[PDB]
Scaffold this active site. Structure first.
Site, PDB file in Angstrom:
ATOM      1  N   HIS F 115     -38.128 -35.129 -17.850  1.00  0.00           N
ATOM      2  CA  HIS F 115     -38.677 -36.425 -18.233  1.00  0.00           C
ATOM      3  C   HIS F 115     -37.796 -37.169 -19.229  1.00  0.00           C
ATOM      4  O   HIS F 115     -37.845 -38.403 -19.271  1.00  0.00           O
ATOM      5  CB  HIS F 115     -40.079 -36.249 -18.823  1.00  0.00           C
ATOM      6  CG  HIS F 115     -40.088 -35.659 -20.198  1.00  0.00           C
ATOM      7  ND1 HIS F 115     -40.096 -34.300 -20.426  1.00  0.00           N
ATOM      8  CD2 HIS F 115     -40.096 -36.243 -21.420  1.00  0.00           C
ATOM      9  CE1 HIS F 115     -40.106 -34.073 -21.728  1.00  0.00           C
ATOM     10  NE2 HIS F 115     -40.106 -35.236 -22.353  1.00  0.00           N
ATOM     11  N   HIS F 179     -39.658 -35.834 -35.610  1.00  0.00           N
ATOM     12  CA  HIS F 179     -40.800 -35.069 -35.122  1.00  0.00           C
ATOM     13  C   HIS F 179     -40.373 -33.611 -35.031  1.00  0.00           C
ATOM     14  O   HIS F 179     -39.187 -33.289 -35.144  1.00  0.00           O
ATOM     15  CB  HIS F 179     -41.299 -35.568 -33.761  1.00  0.00           C
ATOM     16  CG  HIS F 179     -40.288 -35.459 -32.661  1.00  0.00           C
ATOM     17  ND1 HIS F 179     -39.004 -35.945 -32.774  1.00  0.00           N
ATOM     18  CD2 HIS F 179     -40.379 -34.929 -31.418  1.00  0.00           C
ATOM     19  CE1 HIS F 179     -38.345 -35.711 -31.654  1.00  0.00           C
ATOM     20  NE2 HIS F 179     -39.158 -35.097 -30.814  1.00  0.00           N
TER      21      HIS F 179
HETATM   22  O1  LIG Z   1     -40.844 -31.057 -21.452  1.00  0.00           O
HETATM   23  C1  LIG Z   1     -41.282 -30.081 -22.116  1.00  0.00           C
HETATM   24  O2  LIG Z   1     -41.216 -28.919 -21.639  1.00  0.00           O
HETATM   25  C2  LIG Z   1     -41.894 -30.307 -23.496  1.00  0.00           C
HETATM   26  C3  LIG Z   1     -40.911 -31.097 -24.355  1.00  0.00           C
HETATM   27  C4  LIG Z   1     -41.665 -31.813 -25.471  1.00  0.00           C
HETATM   28  C5  LIG Z   1     -42.700 -31.171 -26.126  1.00  0.00           C
HETATM   29  C6  LIG Z   1     -43.386 -31.822 -27.137  1.00  0.00           C
HETATM   30  C7  LIG Z   1     -43.035 -33.112 -27.497  1.00  0.00           C
HETATM   31  C8  LIG Z   1     -41.999 -33.754 -26.841  1.00  0.00           C
HETATM   32  O3  LIG Z   1     -41.643 -35.060 -27.201  1.00  0.00           O
HETATM   33  C9  LIG Z   1     -41.314 -33.104 -25.829  1.00  0.00           C
HETATM   34  O4  LIG Z   1     -40.266 -33.757 -25.167  1.00  0.00           O
HETATM   35 FE   LIG Z   2     -38.466 -35.142 -26.950  1.00  0.00          FE
END
Ligand SMILES: O=C(O)CCc1cccc(O)c1O
Ligand SMILES: [Fe+2]
Ligand SMILES: O=C(O)CCc1cccc(O)c1O
Ligand SMILES: O=C(O)CCc1cccc(O)c1O
Ligand SMILES: O=C(O)CCc1cccc(O)c1O
Ligand SMILES: O=C(O)CCc1cccc(O)c1O
Ligand SMILES: O=C(O)CCc1cccc(O)c1O
Ligand SMILES: [Fe+2]
Ligand SMILES: [Fe+2]
Ligand SMILES: [Fe+2]
Ligand SMILES: [Fe+2]
Ligand SMILES: [Fe+2]
Lengths: 314, 314, 314, 314, 314, 314
Positions: F115, F179
């Site tokens: 993503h 974060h």
């Molecule tokens: O894609 C995944 O496996 C989780 C990654 C992911 C987890 C928490 C906050 C995020 O912003 C993030 O990108």
């Molecule tokens: Fe992220």
């Protein structure tokens, strides 16, 4: 930062020996125009660089530069006599700053001065006690003499100090341009002449002063008869010096030596060091431009008359 | 190219106020050993840096540096009185060279010197008229005062001039270490003492000299009773200064200012400037090494006694 | 110009928690050999860099560097209690010189020091009141913390000041090598804990001291059981740090940051800054060489024991 | 980025001792005009550099610079009392950034402040709790003192940090101009006075505060009677300092030393360091232009009143 | 600082294809002498630079440099199969230091190595599990390839890290000299060999391995028949490269580009990058001198055999 | 040459967890305005810097930088899935140029993306297959990590390559602001977790993906309940970072270290490295100006939302 500068030749033989009336009128008109410009400027402080003629400084202690915390004009050759208004605290601060800047400056609290100091104050300001004045004596008659570079650095230090006072400052140079008057020397002196040269000449009796003035007047008359009795005038070098000052090329004068200057123009030409100092001072205030250039070889007087002015452009 | 240097503290209170016999014998032995080393060196020229104590220079004209073409001792505090042997031509050449080097140096032909000049000549050379001497005055009592950097360049210029004479030169520094004796000041003066400070102190009557000496002796005795009547001695700074001089780190003294030195050690500590000049001079002759270090805080005299020597490595 | 240096880890848990007898004998022998070398050197002055453990400095005012003009030991963890002999005039001169050198240094006239200051004095000198000492506190527990470059410059300034004293100087570093024992923090504190952290913890009652010591001992025992209760020891980084110190590559530590060091080795590892300062000091005395390297990870105590020495090759 | 700056003298003797009504009205008008300009600017953050007068910091720990994460005004000389609004996270970030920049900065979480901090907030902002404030204490009474260069770099680091906050920042300098009121000293203190100086003076009883205020008022009245009881005011140096600040020539102040400043103007003149810091800060925001210059030597109060402002031009 | 270096060509065709017995004996004697020198040196750590031949790294992710925290040998061409002893903490510290030095380095916790890694360990150390090893992979078959300058910087960073470990380090370069055997390419591939090149080549079945080995052996035999089937050997460039390495002129290799090297000597000659890295590493330990130079073009094997050693001058 | 830049935070929790409807409307409006500006620009090439979340890169080979010659989106968290349009020849030329510029860049021909890559393409371009794209993976989760300086150099090299293509280029940064969500680590992992970390996690079953998504959602909900379960958001540092990026002061980020950033803001804040790269790229196209600044701390999602744009001023 606002600053004015005026350099003018001084001559003790005003009225005693006179040129043609037209020349006198022209000189008086030039002086009056300079006085009008100065009055229009309306200064608050005056810094006056001037030489001595064996009247206040002698061989008991002969400094290259001196600052007068307290000064009194003795009134010789018809000039004004009396005490000069000097701000004591400002003078002491200036002495401290110049000493810290790297200049070895002597300090005097009772300085007897002569027509070299008094005449420009009368001619340009109207009197001795009009504006507060800082008097700076520069040696020009007794060897060894300061060079052009040290004089330029002294002027730069004084200008750098005065640029932080939030005042309108007028700079004056009182030296002549080119001449060779009969000046007593230490090497060729006799017993009485040596005794007078090594001090003890401050409280001169009026008879000796009259004899000295008569000798100067007679030498001037003989010079009018013929210029080879003394060193002849050198208009070429005077014009070169003035042009160098106006074009902002003062540093080029560091190559000229004292003996070279004495050979080219004469022993007394060293008075022009005062002019150099004045110009250096104005270089500390920023951009400036010159005006009122005037030069004329006047043989009736010993020197060659000159006058120049400059103003800071804001 | 051969050079010797010896710096030694001078104290007018030799015999007037005395410490224990043991320390007196130790000081006399140190002085005798230094005299023996100097006699072994067999110098041909002597350059002496010494201060004045308001006996030869006053506020009529107060220069930072002065050179004595002619010098005469006044014989104060039991010191020798007589005319010093000065080579006129060599002195004039030195003045010309130092002026050309960029130092604003005053010149005197009748210079009156106090015990500061006379005592080292008696103690180390054996008399006033043994060896030709060039007397150099450095101001240390009247503000504004020269800095460490200007004094260092003065010493460097003098050494550079003397390195070309093909002679054996002995350099002397007559200043003392940290101390604070009662010295008249212009700011806090009254009418009579202002008049004496500005001038007329050269022709000082004997009664005023007796009163001054008695006041100095009384102040010394009170200092022996307690050191807080004046500025207390500072052995730490004295040892630091001596170590800096020996290690060839003289330039590190350029960071120290005049007010900082006065606050740390006292107003009279500025006499040590003479020492600085001396060391700078020897730096012009090449490699050198030090010897004969001696320091001791003597409370019976006002100053803290010190002595140091150096020799060039040919 | 002679100098000696010895850096040694300190541990409050001597006798309270003990390792095997053989390693204890080895550590005691190393300490005895270092003491013998120091006694052979026969120092005249001691400059001691040591940290604090929330015993003398708190969050009322937390400086990065402090100099103790007057210091007194509180005798915690069985260490000696008493007043340290500090030369007041020398300390004030050092403070002035370091302030002028460009280091923002705090001064204290009543400094309470914990075992970090007292233990090296007992172990290496034999007592608290043997040799005059200049105590220097470096912060290592309260963020923000000083960096390696500023600590190096502080050490260089102190060494440059002390190189002009004409004495034999011994430099000491008292911090540990690598550990992370339980240390109270401001962010996670409670009301009483915050009140104790923001001052008011100087006059701690004996009950709170006993509780703190018991907590430290229990945490040490748990660390002996397993090193993951705290940050585990890092022998690799300790050996790299010691090797960098010996090879004269101290400036390479300027690239390491505080957070990087905390992540790599632990929060308390910042005590090693003291070591850095010490080494910087000896760099001011000229050429030097190291000796007596010893390192051993002792899990019975929290930290990893280390010891190093250096001598100026005069 | 946009920034405003205003430097103003503070005086505890407002109402207790009063000058003529006309000059009081003039001072009030100047203050009101400055307040109106500040209100027109509408700042979002205030950085306040201020000194202390032996009410919040003592000789237990005396830092050169300190940042107040938590500050409380005690309310002396009729000034306001209470907690100050300080953003904790912003203050901690500022401390971290300034430490990383190479400045040894102390940090306090309970900082007791006096009229030096409180009075400008009341006069220019209208109250203590109007705008978030970062208080920075600069030492000016306890030697050794920080220099002009270190203060300039502290101001530059703070301005560089604050230029990235995307806020409108107002900078304040609360220090006064040349003066020297009676201030307790460590060297000349007695037993009780030394005990009060080395801490323990935070919780002063009201009787001692009344006695101190009465002594200050009486000394001010004697100064009005004659200025030689303390160090006399120096308008020349004050005007020079203001002109140097306005012309962007702050670096020229690096040549001035602490002892030189104390001798020229007085021991308390070091408060002007705050002004320097403020100006340095605004130099981080780009081009700026000065305004609102006002100076007047008020003998009725001890200090010489001054006021200046500057604005970032966009 | 103690360091040894040995660079040696590796050849999978040992026993499968053999030259005359005399040259085989000569090669075995050279290898035995190098092994004897290494055993005399007695190293504590091994840093091994070796290439890959499409057995552990593929086009799924192809880095220029890689560090193996965990490595396992697959045992191809009769080489030893097993797991290499790698110190995990030391490897992680090395990775952190090299990344901080400015090198973009990949890390792997399960790295499948081939005969290029295993054969030098068997021949020079006696086995895979004798001394701890840090395996470093350099890409040499898949374009784009790293240049000489980046390889030199990688070697310098690794040597700079390892010089602070206080250990005896042996550096190895496993790459061969000029040659060009048949190597599959991505551009000219078919479907099946494209699939194998991108991935799935790790768990390669034994039949494909047998076919690959048979193809390599047949190509070697054809090369023995005639050198024009592949790129012919270039003894001149090999001798120039070895001479440049010995004379300490490694930086001169920065001017050579990858395509120029491929045109001059062949595509596989890029394996020599390993050699470069090794030499760069030893330059971090100080002065060194070379020895044991041996070169011989063996046509029976594809490559031209070479061997070189270097030792630090302690 | 013409260039556009847009940096935007990405969040997998869109729809799964939602803030107030007004905040969602504001975010959607900002995104729509950015999309409209991009559509008005009408780019011809897209260079997309993005991180990974342990979906395409694992510890089998972990590079700091990677270029995707062939990329496929796996469609996690509801994002789109399918092949990405990558120009193979242009990608290979870019890889060659960047490798030659001095950057150690990994190359992949089958890159599985998540993503982080897909969401910006959907939101800003309208789909995955609209414009040709060069995908650049930057590591931000697995230590050791690349620094700010190397990331800036990578961006500069890519921009320098793309400035010679005679195309309109759009630069994207997909990283998020400060974060710290729960992220698996190698040090604290168990057997199954370690096995998944060292590769073998590409073909994850849907059940493990569901469990991971549920755990992330639950952790986000707990963070909404209280921010101390993870690292609390740091608006101050986010605003400082954005202001530094806009003011063209990117090089000032070279002083910040990785551990310092992790301590100040959190481990995941390293994603912002992508932003840095993007900005560096636009600096190769000449003069540019920024716009569309938006920041808001959204606690409902874990990250703090931000958005920024820039355009080349031709
Ligand atoms: O894609 C995944 O496996 C989780 C990654 C992911 C987890 C928490 C906050 C995020 O912003 C993030 O990108
Ligand atoms: Fe992220
Ligand atoms: O006062 C004296 O002794 C005469 C000085 C003097 C003589 C002639 C021309 C001059 O310009 C001058 O100044
Ligand atoms: O001669 C004088 O006028 C007195 C000088 C003087 C006074 C006190 C202490 C001294 O060391 C000193 O030289
Ligand atoms: O002295 C104290 O107050 C306790 C400080 C402390 C705590 C743990 C381990 C230590 O080594 C230590 O010094
Ligand atoms: O608050 C105090 O303790 C007195 C400080 C103080 C005294 C006199 C003049 C001042 O300007 C001043 O600040
Ligand atoms: O190991 C393999 O897969 C074959 C690699 C290979 C092929 C030809 C010549 C070689 O020297 C070589 O190493
Ligand atoms: Fe004249
Ligand atoms: Fe004296
Ligand atoms: Fe400790
Ligand atoms: Fe005040
Ligand atoms: Fe090979």
């Amino acid at each position: 930062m606002h600053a004015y500068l005026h350099c003018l030749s001084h001559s003790p033989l005003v009225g005693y020996v006179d040129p043609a009336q037209e020349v006198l009128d022209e000189v008086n008109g030039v002086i009056a125009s300079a006085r009008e410009r100065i009055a229009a400027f309306s200064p608050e402080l005056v810094v006056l660089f001037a030489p001595d003629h064996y009247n206040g400084f002698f061989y008991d202690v002969m400094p290259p530069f001196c600052l007068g915390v307290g000064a009194t004009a003795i009134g010789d050759f018809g000039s004004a006599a009396g005490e000069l208004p000097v701000p004591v605290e400002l003078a002491e601060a200036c002495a401290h700053a110049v000493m810290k800047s790297g200049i070895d400056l002597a300090v005097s609290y009772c300085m007897q001065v002569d027509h070299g100091f008094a005449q420009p104050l009368e001619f340009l300001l109207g009197g001795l006690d009009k504006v507060p004045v800082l008097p700076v004596f520069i040696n020009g008659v007794a060897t060894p003499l300061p060079g052009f570079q040290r004089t330029r650095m002294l002027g730069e230090a004084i200008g750098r100090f005065t640029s932080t006072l939030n005042k309108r400052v007028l700079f004056l140079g009182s030296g002549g341009l080119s001449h060779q008057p009969p000046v007593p020397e230490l090497a060729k002196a006799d017993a009485h002449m040596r005794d007078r040269l090594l001090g003890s000449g401050k409280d001169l009796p009026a008879s000796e002063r009259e004899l000295r003035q008569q000798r100067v007047i007679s030498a001037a008359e003989k010079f009018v008869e013929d210029q080879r009795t003394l060193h002849p005038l050198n208009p070429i070098w005077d014009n070169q010096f003035m042009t160098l000052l106006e074009q902002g090329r003062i540093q080029e004068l560091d190559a000229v030596s004292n003996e070279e200057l004495s050979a080219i123009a004469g022993k007394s030409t060293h008075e022009i060091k005062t002019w150099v100092a004045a110009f250096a001072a104005i270089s500390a205030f920023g951009n400036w431009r010159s005006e009122g250039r005037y030069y004329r070889p006047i043989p009736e007087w010993i020197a060659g008359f000159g006058s120049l002015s400059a103003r800071t452009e804001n």
